């Protein structure tokens, strides 16, 4: 039960994936939607418009699944490689209630990415039943970008 | 009833310790940040740094990294913050507070203990 | 750092006048800023968050705005409005305040 919801197969569609915010300028646009695994072209990742640990990528499933993964990148914008070390996980049925994902009766902070290219996989588990997911950067290097995959089932 | 309720002020002599307190009730303890604040009398406010109870993580201002430590106890919903080594410059009114763990909200900063005085001296 | 400087610092105003007090940032802070009030018992209040959105238990004459990097907060007065206000950064951190400014009752 390890298969790609649909985030680079574009089978979640772009309005099904928000943010907190993200970065945009005069000449890139760092929109959620392009915070797709493996994704190419230019500013081919999520950026949020501030680096703090408060940002959020929110992705809705639009329809309750089973999360049994998530696998992350970053993305290098010309000499600068960003991604986000360390990140935690929360979901949510309604999209307005958020609870965050414990391990051991404590919160897991998740490790994440060494670089810009490698995905890596952290495994979800107990397995994770919702309709929304919502990823939160708490360290990073350079800036905080982002391109994802769930992994899972219905 | 979101409340925070501080520790009683104190005193100190110079090199030692203090371990003030912050007990939250209202709400879930766990997922949201404690934020402690300094005050110097006559001077303004200063960021400490932060805990999220939930997990145990920290963030510091680069300024207090050696002098300010954090704790969390989830069994009374509490947390605490130890200043080492008192000088003092250490001696100031010390707030907590709380943020959201994610943007969007209404809990930023929204709730502000009394304060907690901390007097450095023999 | 992101440094925020406060102006005026020190203010006295009348009761009834309309009063303005602004933050301006070191950088780009994107609307993540908020407006604090402290009285002289030592106690803290929200007043703003997210640069212009009022504090639910926050009198409807309070109100924040900004024009970059220029963010400001209105009192359209009362004998209640002596303190001292701040503006706090949390765009990145570390968090960072303005230095405050202090508003008192002309009489």
């Known amino acids: 039960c390890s298969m790609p919801l649909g985030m680079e197969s574009k089978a979640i569609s772009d309005a099904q994936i928000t943010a907190s915010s993200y970065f945009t300028n005069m000449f890139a646009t760092w929109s959620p939607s392009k915070a797709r695994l493996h994704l190419q072209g230019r500013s081919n990742a999520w950026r949020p418009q501030v680096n703090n640990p408060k940002e959020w990528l929110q992705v809705d499933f639009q329809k309750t699944m089973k999360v049994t993964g998530v696998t992350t990148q970053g993305v290098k914008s010309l000499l600068t490689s960003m991604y986000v070390k360390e990140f935690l996980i929360s979901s949510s049925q309604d999209g307005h209630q958020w609870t965050l994902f414990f391990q051991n009766g404590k919160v897991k902070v998740f490790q994440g990415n060494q670089d810009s290219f490698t995905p890596v996989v952290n495994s979800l588990d107990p397995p994770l039943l919702t309709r929304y997911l919502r990823i939160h950067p708490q360290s990073w290097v350079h800036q905080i970008a982002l391109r994802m995959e769930v992994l899972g089932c219905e | 009833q979101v409340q925070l309720q501080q520790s009683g002020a104190e005193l100190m002599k110079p090199g030692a310790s203090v371990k003030i307190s912050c007990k939250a009730t209202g709400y879930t303890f766990s997922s949201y940040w404690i934020e402690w604040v300094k005050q110097r009398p006559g001077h303004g406010l200063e960021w400490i740094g932060e805990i999220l109870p939930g997990s145990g993580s920290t963030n510091y201002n680069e300024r207090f990294k050696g002098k300010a430590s954090f704790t969390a106890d989830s069994s009374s919903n509490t947390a605490y913050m130890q200043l080492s080594s008192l000088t003092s410059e250490d001696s100031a009114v010390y707030y907590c507070?709380?943020?959201?763990?994610?943007?969007?909200?209404?809990?930023?900063?929204?709730?502000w203990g009394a304060g907690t005085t901390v007097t450095v001296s023999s | 750092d992101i440094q925020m400087t406060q102006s005026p610092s020190s203010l006295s105003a009348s009761l009834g006048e309309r009063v303005s007090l602004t933050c301006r940032a070191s950088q780009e802070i994107s609307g993540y800023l908020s407006w604090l009030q402290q009285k002289p018992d030592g106690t803290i209040k929200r007043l703003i968050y997210?640069?212009?959105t009022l504090d639910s238990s926050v009198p409807k004459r309070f109100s924040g705005s900004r024009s970059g990097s220029d963010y400001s907060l209105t009192i359209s007065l009362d004998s209640e409005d002596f303190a001292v206000y701040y503006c706090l950064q949390y765009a990145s951190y570390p968090y960072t305040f303005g230095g405050g400014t202090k508003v008192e009752i002309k009489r």
């Open positions: 997210a640069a212009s």
């Open positions: 507070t709380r943020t959201s763990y994610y943007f969007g909200s209404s809990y930023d900063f929204d709730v």
